[PDB]
From Swiss-Prot, chains A, B:
It comes from the Eukaryota. The chain holds residues 58 to 359 of 549 of the full protein. Cell adhesion molecule that promotes cell-cell adhesion through heterophilic trans-interactions with nectins-like or other nectins, such as trans-interaction with NECTIN2 at Sertoli-spermatid junctions. Trans-interaction with PVR induces activation of CDC42 and RAC small G proteins through common signaling molecules such as SRC and RAP1. Induces endocytosis-mediated down-regulation of PVR from the cell surface, resulting in reduction of cell movement and proliferation. Involved in axon guidance by promoting contacts between the commissural axons and the floor plate cells. The lineage of its organism: Eukaryota, Metazoa, Chordata, Craniata, Vertebrata. GO terms for cellular component: adherens junction; apical junction complex; axon; cell-cell contact zone; cell-cell junction; dendrite; hippocampal mossy fiber to CA3 synapse; plasma membrane. Keywords: Cell adhesion, Cell junction, Cell membrane, Disulfide bond, Glycoprotein, Immunoglobulin domain, Membrane, Postsynaptic cell membrane, Repeat, Signal, Synapse, Transmembrane, Transmembrane helix. This is Nectin-3. It comes from Homo sapiens. Residues 2-108 form the Ig-like V-type domain. GO terms for molecular function: cell adhesion mediator activity; cell adhesion molecule binding; identical protein binding; protein homodimerization activity. Predominantly expressed in testis and placenta as well as in many cell lines, including epithelial cell lines.
Amino acid sequence: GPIIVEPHVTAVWGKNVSLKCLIEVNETITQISWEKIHGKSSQTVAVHHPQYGFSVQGEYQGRVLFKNYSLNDATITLHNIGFSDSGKYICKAVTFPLGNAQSSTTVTVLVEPTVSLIKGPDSLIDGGNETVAAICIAATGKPVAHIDWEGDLGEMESTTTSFPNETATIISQYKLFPTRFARGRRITCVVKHPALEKDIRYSFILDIQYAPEVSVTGYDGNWFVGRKGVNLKCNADANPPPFKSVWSRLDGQWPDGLLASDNTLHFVHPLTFNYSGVYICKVTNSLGQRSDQKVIYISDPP
Amino acid sequence: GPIIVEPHVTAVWGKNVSLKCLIEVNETITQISWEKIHGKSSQTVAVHHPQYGFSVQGEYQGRVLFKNYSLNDATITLHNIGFSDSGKYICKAVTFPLGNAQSSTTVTVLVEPTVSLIKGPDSLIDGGNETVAAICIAATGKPVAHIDWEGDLGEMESTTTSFPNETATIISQYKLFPTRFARGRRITCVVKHPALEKDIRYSFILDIQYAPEVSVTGYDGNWFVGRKGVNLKCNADANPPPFKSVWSRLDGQWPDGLLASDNTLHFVHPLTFNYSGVYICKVTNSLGQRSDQKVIYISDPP
Ligand SMILES: *[C@@H]1O[C@H](CO[C@@H]2O[C@@H](C)[C@@H](O)[C@@H](O)[C@@H]2O)[C@@H](O[C@@H]2O[C@H](CO)[C@@H](O[C@@H]3O[C@H](CO[C@H]4O[C@H](CO)[C@@H](O)[C@H](O)[C@@H]4O)[C@@H](O)[C@H](O[C@H]4O[C@H](CO)[C@@H](O)[C@H](O)[C@@H]4O)[C@@H]3O)[C@H](O)[C@H]2NC(C)=O)[C@H](O)[C@H]1NC(C)=O
Ligand SMILES: *[C@@H]1O[C@H](CO[C@@H]2O[C@@H](C)[C@@H](O)[C@@H](O)[C@@H]2O)[C@@H](O[C@@H]2O[C@H](CO)[C@@H](O[C@@H]3O[C@H](CO[C@H]4O[C@H](CO)[C@@H](O)[C@H](O)[C@@H]4O)[C@@H](O)[C@H](O[C@H]4O[C@H](CO)[C@@H](O)[C@H](O)[C@@H]4O)[C@@H]3O)[C@H](O)[C@H]2NC(C)=O)[C@H](O)[C@H]1NC(C)=O
Ligand SMILES: *[C@@H]1O[C@H](CO)[C@@H](O[C@@H]2O[C@H](CO)[C@@H](O[C@@H]3O[C@H](CO[C@H]4O[C@H](CO)[C@@H](O)[C@H](O)[C@@H]4O)[C@@H](O)[C@H](O[C@H]4O[C@H](CO)[C@@H](O)[C@H](O)[C@@H]4O)[C@@H]3O)[C@H](O)[C@H]2NC(C)=O)[C@H](O)[C@H]1NC(C)=O
Ligand SMILES: *[C@@H]1O[C@H](CO)[C@@H](O[C@@H]2O[C@H](CO)[C@@H](O[C@@H]3O[C@H](CO[C@H]4O[C@H](CO)[C@@H](O)[C@H](O)[C@@H]4O)[C@@H](O)[C@H](O[C@H]4O[C@H](CO)[C@@H](O)[C@H](O)[C@@H]4O)[C@@H]3O)[C@H](O)[C@H]2NC(C)=O)[C@H](O)[C@H]1NC(C)=O
Ligand SMILES: *[C@@H]1O[C@H](CO)[C@@H](O[C@@H]2O[C@H](CO)[C@@H](O[C@@H]3O[C@H](CO[C@H]4O[C@H](CO)[C@@H](O)[C@H](O)[C@@H]4O)[C@@H](O)[C@H](O[C@H]4O[C@H](CO)[C@@H](O)[C@H](O)[C@@H]4O)[C@@H]3O)[C@H](O)[C@H]2NC(C)=O)[C@H](O)[C@H]1NC(C)=O
Ligand SMILES: *[C@@H]1O[C@H](CO)[C@@H](O[C@@H]2O[C@H](CO)[C@@H](O[C@@H]3O[C@H](CO[C@H]4O[C@H](CO)[C@@H](O)[C@H](O)[C@@H]4O)[C@@H](O)[C@H](O[C@H]4O[C@H](CO)[C@@H](O)[C@H](O)[C@@H]4O)[C@@H]3O)[C@H](O)[C@H]2NC(C)=O)[C@H](O)[C@H]1NC(C)=O
Ligand SMILES: *[C@@H]1O[C@H](CO)[C@@H](O[C@@H]2O[C@H](CO)[C@@H](O[C@@H]3O[C@H](CO)[C@@H](O)[C@H](O)[C@@H]3O)[C@H](O)[C@H]2NC(C)=O)[C@H](O)[C@H]1NC(C)=O
Ligand SMILES: *[C@@H]1O[C@H](CO)[C@@H](O[C@@H]2O[C@H](CO)[C@@H](O[C@@H]3O[C@H](CO)[C@@H](O)[C@H](O)[C@@H]3O)[C@H](O)[C@H]2NC(C)=O)[C@H](O)[C@H]1NC(C)=O
Ligand SMILES: *[C@@H]1O[C@H](CO)[C@@H](O)[C@H](O)[C@H]1NC(C)=O
Ligand SMILES: *[C@@H]1O[C@H](CO)[C@@H](O)[C@H](O)[C@H]1NC(C)=O
């Protein structure tokens, strides 16, 4: 076309926008205008003369600048978009003598959301009813921002409310039946929105609590009378960390010749036909006490 | 209005026309255009710059001039109208920085007729069937010229044929039962047409022929024997003029003591009891012979 401009542009709230316009005609140029039309009425915006400088109209006076001082780039950046810039703007080029041609660009206003991740309120213990683990918030976005979680470990869901301003807020609530096998999993809501030159992401690790989980190693196949220096450790994974890890013998009695370094159980005396009892360590955290036992047998070969 | 121009103007074929346009705005002016639009396409006509002179477009190049060298009278005379100037022309004023406003004027083409009066072909004798006395011709007028006769002495009538060119010719035939009492009457067709700043008229006198019309004066009440020096003139009005005006006595006989000076009849001898006859002069023209007589009586008192 005689005047080439890109149409259907989109400008971001509060930020600026470059309204490119170029006029490569072997014709000699005498005036250069920009006009936003309110309906059938043409409010002028910017004007460039080769003799009588520039002109910027009220109320655009502060918020428009000419990117090029040449008679050829009608290119202008509109400083600081508001809502009311949503319309059709035409670039009027006056030549001598063809008259004037015009090209239009329709700019739609577009406002960013502001995102937030918020820890769901109830704590996530093991094997309990569905719980809300996290809420992702895309605030006052126009158009409605969009949302998506990457965990495939539970269920998305969202309620979205919209405004007079012709923007909206959606809130995605991520929920799961919590299991300890999901300890420290990365939950992450991505939010995709037109005005996001690169979509924005917010991340989480799951903190699932659970009851203690205990397992004593130490007893290999057979323990023979007089075997010297063998142990039992009360290995246990729990969250929160536990506090109590008492090392009781189920047969109420408890012989000497034992000690409980760390939570290992030492038999610092060589083995006797004593000791022949079912040993049980009992580990306790915020969520309660759990225990495991190893049936200890002392034997002797021919 | 911002730009004041007169609308719905009418331009006369072959002649010129002034397209007035004036732009009294306290705004400073930067370009001045005239554009005839063919449908939705704007062929520029004239352009005025305060720096880079004038411009006249093809093919208007010869036929347009700027009536005012000022930046304020877009007034132009379009030299030599043809048919194809029948349309809407707009005057474009470019200011700095309002942009541009425009006012339109719709010029309809209008061609003069050319008028003629032509003597109807058959001659007008007296008391004959209606005859066509004159034909008035309004030729190739656009729109159809109009016609009217002023004589109230017969009947108008007209046949009007129209053309491709979107002009027409009407021919009014004026007809009457001709009577001699209408000799030398002014018949006149007026032709009224939009393009005639003062309507045009063509005039005629009627030339009605007639048979001769005769009347002898001379005989007063009584003529007495011996009365000295009395005459009879053969007064007669006819058209065409007559040629023969013989002065015969109906009683075949014709005494001496008479003479026919001019067409008076002298009795140069004092009256006798002769002369006592019915005297008749016979007048003859193109249309034939007519006559009148006076019964002459000579008497004598006691
Ligand atoms: C296990 O969790 C189950 C789901 O709970 C979830 O997890 C929690 C932590 C949150 O994250 C929450 O968002 C999750 O949904 C839970 O099962 C649920 O039990 C409750 C009842 O105790 C149900 O709520 C009731 O829902 C009905 C729905 O009625 C219909 O219409 C509504 C629209 O209004 C639709 O949305 C529904 O699909 C239905 O078609 C309500 O009518 C009802 O309202 C009541 O309270 C109002 C108060 O004004 C009264 O006026 C009414 O008369 C009712 O009494 C309840 O809100 C819930 O729907 C149900 N299932 C689900 C899938 O949510 C279960 O309790 C947990 N297991 C336990 C505790 O053992
Ligand atoms: C006295 O003058 C009378 C009128 O003549 C006028 O004066 C002359 C000098 C011219 O200026 C002339 O323009 C004036 O009109 C005259 O009376 C007329 O006599 C003739 C016949 O001798 C009539 O002509 C005939 O008219 C008829 C009309 O028929 C109808 O249709 C036509 C349309 O076609 C209408 O216009 C009429 O109103 C009727 O409704 C014709 O049909 C006819 O055509 C004939 O000739 C063609 C030749 O192809 C044949 O095909 C047909 O068969 C016909 O034979 C005639 O043309 C005339 O109308 C009539 N009256 C008037 C008012 O004109 C009269 O003769 C004179 N007195 C004398 C000579 O003693
Ligand atoms: C879209 O367009 C907008 C604005 O057109 C751009 O954002 C602009 O960013 C500039 C640069 O930061 C802003 O101008 C800055 O103003 C600062 C504040 O001025 C002072 O006012 C008085 C001065 O006495 C005091 O209150 C105080 O000193 C304030 O600072 C200046 O400080 C900045 O000066 C800078 O330049 C000078 C010149 O060398 C340096 O000496 C300084 O170190 C400093 O770098 C500057 O002038 C402007 O206000 C912003 N406009 C806004 C907010 O709308 C966007 O960047 C642009 N967007 C894109 C993507 O292009
Ligand atoms: C179209 O329509 C919607 C709905 O009306 C607008 O959304 C509102 O936007 C404004 C501004 O973004 C929001 O108002 C802000 O509230 C903040 C909350 O402050 C705290 O205290 C409140 C209690 O009242 C708590 O709820 C909250 O958690 C916070 O702890 C204020 O901090 C903001 O004020 C800030 O700016 C001012 C001026 O610069 C400073 O003086 C302050 O110090 C502070 O920094 C502000 O008032 C409002 O909450 C939004 N409503 C929503 C999201 O529902 C959209 O703005 C509008 N869209 C467009 C594009 O204009
Ligand atoms: C609408 O506009 C039209 C034209 O624009 C007007 O009509 C014009 O009338 C002018 C004046 O008569 C015409 O121009 C005249 O041309 C004549 C012919 O030029 C010569 O060409 C060569 C020269 O060597 C020879 O064949 C021969 O000499 C021809 O004459 C000139 O003779 C005229 O000269 C006159 O001015 C000079 C200057 O002083 C005098 O010395 C002379 O004595 C003489 O007066 C003259 O230049 C023009 O052609 C017409 N245009 C046409 C026909 O379209 C209408 O009047 C106007 N209508 C209205 C109502 O405004
Ligand atoms: C739209 O349409 C109509 C219909 O076609 C046009 O009307 C014609 O117009 C032209 C020009 O006016 C007329 O043609 C002229 O004829 C004249 C007649 O000359 C004599 O000889 C003829 C025999 O052929 C006799 O019938 C007649 O009585 C004359 O005795 C010519 O003299 C004209 O030529 C003249 O100009 C040329 C060039 O300048 C010179 O060289 C000559 O010497 C001479 O001066 C001319 O040819 C024609 O008769 C019209 N037809 C009609 C009236 O039915 C309209 O012109 C048109 N309308 C418009 C606005 O353009
Ligand atoms: C205002 O607009 C003009 C014209 O659009 C911009 O012109 C830049 O001018 C330079 C030099 O005149 C052009 O680059 C040339 O590239 C050759 C490489 O062969 C180099 O040798 C020259 O030195 C020169 O750099 C360039 O085409 C042109 N840029 C554009 C986008 O057209 C100018 O940048 C603009 N000014 C401002 C302040 O924005
Ligand atoms: C071109 O257009 C101009 C402006 O329309 C025409 O201006 C004529 O200029 C004269 C003098 O400048 C004006 O008349 C003034 O009248 C007073 C009477 O008080 C007299 O004292 C001055 O000497 C002068 O004559 C007049 O207003 C103006 N005419 C019009 C129609 O506006 C000018 O005539 C045009 N030029 C040509 C060549 O057509
Ligand atoms: C085992 O220890 C107990 C202490 O309760 C002691 O009375 C008993 O004699 C011991 N038995 C053996 C075989 O060492
Ligand atoms: C009248 O004149 C005639 C000539 O024809 C003549 O014979 C006669 O005598 C005259 N009569 C009188 C009274 O004069």
